[PDB]
Design a binder for this molecule. Structure first.
Ligand SMILES: [Mg+2]
Ligand SMILES: [Mg+2]
Ligand SMILES: [Mg+2]
Ligand SMILES: [Mg+2]
Ligand SMILES: [Mg+2]
Ligand SMILES: [Mg+2]
Ligand SMILES: [Mg+2]
Ligand SMILES: [Mg+2]
Ligand SMILES: [Mg+2]
Ligand SMILES: [Mg+2]
Ligand SMILES: [Mg+2]
Ligand SMILES: [Mg+2]
Ligand SMILES: [Mg+2]
Ligand SMILES: [Mg+2]
Ligand SMILES: [Mg+2]
Ligand SMILES: [Mg+2]
Ligand SMILES: [Mg+2]
Ligand SMILES: [Mg+2]
Ligand SMILES: [Mg+2]
Ligand SMILES: [Mg+2]
Ligand SMILES: [Mg+2]
Ligand SMILES: [Mg+2]
Ligand SMILES: [Mg+2]
Ligand SMILES: [Mg+2]
Ligand SMILES: [Mg+2]
Ligand SMILES: [Mg+2]
Ligand SMILES: [Mg+2]
Ligand SMILES: [Mg+2]
Ligand SMILES: [Mg+2]
Ligand SMILES: [Mg+2]
Ligand SMILES: [Mg+2]
Ligand SMILES: [Mg+2]
Ligand SMILES: [Mg+2]
Ligand SMILES: [Mg+2]
Ligand SMILES: [Mg+2]
Ligand SMILES: [Mg+2]
Lengths: 119, 272, 101, 88, 72
RNA sequence: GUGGGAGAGGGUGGUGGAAUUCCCGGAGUAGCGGUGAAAUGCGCAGAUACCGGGAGGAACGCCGAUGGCGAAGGCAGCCACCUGGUCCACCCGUGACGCUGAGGCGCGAAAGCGUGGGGAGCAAACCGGAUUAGAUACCCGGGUAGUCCACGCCCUAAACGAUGCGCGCUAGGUCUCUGGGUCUCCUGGGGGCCGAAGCUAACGCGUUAAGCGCGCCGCCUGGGGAGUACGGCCGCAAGGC
């Protein structure tokens, strides 16, 4: 449909897996990858290494649509975090800054028992 | 609200009567009254088409104003709040400055002595009828037209209301008392406020005869008939349904959806 | 009677004769609830920290009145009947509090 | 809330002489004043139990006062009563 | 950690006044949170008044509820 | 009394943003979730991740504290109205008007109950997946009362400082909240640590007493039986005294 030079790159980084969707400037996904698309199943998806392959592969698919630059927004604590950023910086894809958009309730819904803990 | 009774008879222990302290009209009604032809649930053939009706008090029909768009701009004082036997709600009497009298179905909060008005004008205030398009999103409203100029249809039962949830083109989205979500035309009148006398739903009829006063004749379970009569008629003692539960005419009465599929009105509906 | 400051934020896209349109109704109301204006500052367009109503900006007014205390709540209820009034903030006037002083 | 003059009014009226700032009679009246106000505040806000606690203390202070007064000058007691509308 | 005290930086000002961003704008972090007393250098009583004001300010749209974190 | 303060103190009405969930639109593909590791579950009927719109309920991030208020239970976005207690200064008024308090009355976390409503997230019960010899649990996926509001009940608690209330007397040091001053310092009402004397079985307490004294109330008299039975009173019930 369309091929774009400038773009945007999203990192959803959780304990059980890391997933990277890369968008157009407007925010609509061009293409994406995750710990599972790399070829891991299970806990090994949460790992920092698989997040690396994930982001490299994300970008490799985007660069084939002619992605050049991206703005890299990350969300959430996880071991996939930095190795995902790292992997994007030197991959291809000049990365223009970075942000932490990780969601933080201003004290919203009561959490699951698992995250309630100390009160 | 809700008068209770010491148990000086059985059924006086559970009976519960409406509160009439909102009512200023004593007995009589304004001679906007007209006579009611009681049907007995019988159609123009002499045939019962709706079962277990009949009996119950004589009633005079109070004629009530379901288009407010004649009196556009002409205000009115609220003269009386009265009892109307034909509806769950109460009627309020309006003296227009015109000198004309009309009955309005009486909104919750509406006081005797208030001024009321209806039109594209008018404050957003309890009693005031407006085209829907001019009522601010979010205000709760009763007595809505479904199509323009055709008369109020929705939210007329005591305690009911509707809410304006949004605008789309010439229509607005309302949430009906059913909870259904409906596009209605912006041009349709509505009158701000809930209907009120909302304590209505807590009356406890309390004895058989009180259902008989409202013209509800005893209702008999298909379970208690024979099979000539009903799909549940039959079989020694008691007995369960023996089949998926049915009406006397034999269609299924748990879950079977009965709204016609291809109704044109479906373009304008969104919910339960 | 008590001194309040009435902050009111308006649709930005309103043309000036509409701004004055919404601004009159504001003022009858003020006069109707018994608000006697003292000061005023009309600071107009301003840039917002977050969108109010999908809008990066909003048109600000601030009044300062002496009105009977008990009618302030309805005032603001009525002020807020919008549609173009996107905020009302009605605060009790205070004797300023200074730091480095 | 009872304003400065509003109470001054009540001070002046019940004062046993020029410039009486809180003798027994002024106190009862002054109490009775804010009691009656609270009592109406509760009539509306019936759920406000914290303020009702105070009312109780008010009511009680006023009672102890009134008992002293009824022991010392039983006459200007009965007369303070009917002026203020209290025991019957 | 050194930085500034951030009260030091400006002269007399009204911490009651909820309408001037450029004073109040300076008491918010890079992500927009109200700055802890330690690096505002305010008092006990003073920090409350500051805070309450900042809260108002945000409702009026003048001050943010949160910004993002840039260039980590 | 007069003039001044601080405060998540209480009641009512409004109101804001973040997030969660669901829906609509878009783009987009082969997994997502979840764990110790998994499996259930979800997903090519287009999931997850991404953006735009909308709906709805709950709780208020930073500030925020070793902080403040209340008799206690408790009380935390912002706004207004009504409203309680409280402290300081001035030294003006009454003239012991005081303390305490069996009964009485009122308030009283959570859960629970009735009648309506409301229901996003959570989550007893319940279902399913793992684990185990078993697993009616612990972990995972679901999930209904309930959690929320109004009115009305229930009256309990590690309802704790396990420390009744008022008063006078008995070194200091240090931190902090909030008043007043001849604003380094001094002074008053709170909140914490260390400590004189004394107390204490010890641990510890110590001008916020558990010290030295007076008033008045509540309570104890070995453990179990048992906060059970009986009776009585109260509750819709659970059940409470
Ligand atoms: Mg995993
Ligand atoms: Mg015939
Ligand atoms: Mg008869
Ligand atoms: Mg029957
Ligand atoms: Mg038979
Ligand atoms: Mg037959
Ligand atoms: Mg048959
Ligand atoms: Mg049968
Ligand atoms: Mg037989
Ligand atoms: Mg049988
Ligand atoms: Mg039978
Ligand atoms: Mg239906
Ligand atoms: Mg306060
Ligand atoms: Mg207050
Ligand atoms: Mg979709
Ligand atoms: Mg006060
Ligand atoms: Mg003196
Ligand atoms: Mg003397
Ligand atoms: Mg309770
Ligand atoms: Mg509860
Ligand atoms: Mg039950
Ligand atoms: Mg309930
Ligand atoms: Mg219910
Ligand atoms: Mg639900
Ligand atoms: Mg199981
Ligand atoms: Mg098993
Ligand atoms: Mg579970
Ligand atoms: Mg769950
Ligand atoms: Mg007790
Ligand atoms: Mg005990
Ligand atoms: Mg001290
Ligand atoms: Mg010693
Ligand atoms: Mg024995
Ligand atoms: Mg027990
Ligand atoms: Mg017994
Ligand atoms: Mg007990």
């Amino acid at each position: 449909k369309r091929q774009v030079a400038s773009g945007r790159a999203y990192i959803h980084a959780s304990y059980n897996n890391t997933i990277v969707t890369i968008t157009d400037p407007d925010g609509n996904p061009i293409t994406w990858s995750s710990g599972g698309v790399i070829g891991y199943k299970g806990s090994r998806k949460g790992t920092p290494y698989a997040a690396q392959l994930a982001a490299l592969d994300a970008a490799k698919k985007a660069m084939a649509y002619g992605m050049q630059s991206v703005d890299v927004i990350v969300r959430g604590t996880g071991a996939g975090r930095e190795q995902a950023i790292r992997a994007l910086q030197a991959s291809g894809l000049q990365v223009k800054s970075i942000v932490d958009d990780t969601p933080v309730p201003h004290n919203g819904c009561r959490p699951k028992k698992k995250f309630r803990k100390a009160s | 609200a809700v008068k209770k009774f010491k148990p000086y008879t059985p059924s006086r222990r559970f009976m519960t009567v409406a509160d009439f302290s909102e009512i200023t009209k004593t007995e009589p009604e304004k001679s906007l009254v007209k006579p009611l032809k009681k049907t007995g649930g019988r159609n123009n053939q002499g045939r019962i088409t709706v079962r277990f009706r009949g009996g119950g008090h004589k009633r005079l029909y109070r004629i009530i104003d379901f288009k407010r768009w004649d009196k556009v701009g002409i205000p009115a004082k609220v003269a009386a709040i009265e009892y109307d036997p034909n509806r769950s709600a109460r009627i309020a009497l309006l003296h227009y400055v015109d000198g004309e009298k009309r009955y309005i179905i009486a909104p919750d909060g509406l006081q005797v002595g208030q001024q009321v008005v209806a039109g594209p004008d008018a404050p957003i205030q309890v009693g005031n009828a407006l085209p829907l398009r001019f009522i601010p999103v979010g205000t709760v409203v009763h007595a809505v037209e479904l199509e323009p100029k055709k008369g109020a249809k929705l939210a007329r039962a005591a305690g009911t209301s509707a809410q304006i949830q949004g605008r789309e083109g010439d229509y607005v989205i309302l949430r009906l008392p059913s909870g259904e979500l409906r596009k209605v035309h912006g041009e349709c009148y509505a009158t701000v406020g809930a209907v009120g006398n909302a304590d209505h739903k807590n009356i406890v009829l309390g004895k058989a005869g009180r259902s008989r006063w409202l013209g509800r004749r005893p209702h008999v379970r298909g379970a208690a008939m024979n099979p000539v009569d009903h799909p549940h008629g039959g079989g020694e003692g008691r007995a369960p349904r023996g089949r998926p539960p049915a009406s006397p005419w034999g269609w299924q009465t748990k879950g079977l959806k009965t709204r016609k599929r291809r109704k044109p009105s479906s373009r304008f509906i969104i919910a339960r | 009677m008590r001194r309040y400051e009435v902050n009111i934020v308006l649709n930005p896209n309103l043309d000036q004769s509409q701004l004055a349109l919404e601004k009159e109704i504001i003022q009858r109301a003020l006069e109707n609830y018994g608000a006697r204006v003292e000061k005023v500052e009309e600071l107009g367009l301003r840039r917002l920290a977050y969108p109010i109503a999908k809008d990066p900006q909003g048109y600000f007014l601030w009044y300062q009145v002496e009105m009977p205390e008990d009618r302030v709540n309805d005032l603001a209820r009525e002020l807020r009947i919008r549609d173009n009034v996107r905020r009302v903030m009605v605060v009790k006037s205070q004797e300023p509090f200074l730091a480095n002083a | 809330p009872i304003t400065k003059e509003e109470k001054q009014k009540v001070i002046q009226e019940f004062a046993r002489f020029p410039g009486d700032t809180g003798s027994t009679e002024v106190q009862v009246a002054l109490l009775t004043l804010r009691i009656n106000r609270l009592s109406e505040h509760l009539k509306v806000h019936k759920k406000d139990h914290h303020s009702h606690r105070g009312l109780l203390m008010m009511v009680g202070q006023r009672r102890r006062l009134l008992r002293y007064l009824q022991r010392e000058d039983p006459e200007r007691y009965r007369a303070l009563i009917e002026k203020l509308g209290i025991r019957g | 950690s050194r930085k500034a005290k951030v009260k030091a930086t400006l002269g007399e000002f009204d911490l009651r006044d909820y309408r001037n961003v450029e004073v109040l704008k300076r008491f918010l972090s890079e992500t927009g949170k109200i700055l802890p007393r330690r690096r505002t250098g305010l008092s006990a009583k003073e920090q409350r008044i500051l805070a309450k004001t900042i809260k108002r300010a945000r409702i009026l749209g003048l001050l943010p509820f949160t910004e993002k974190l840039v260039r980590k």
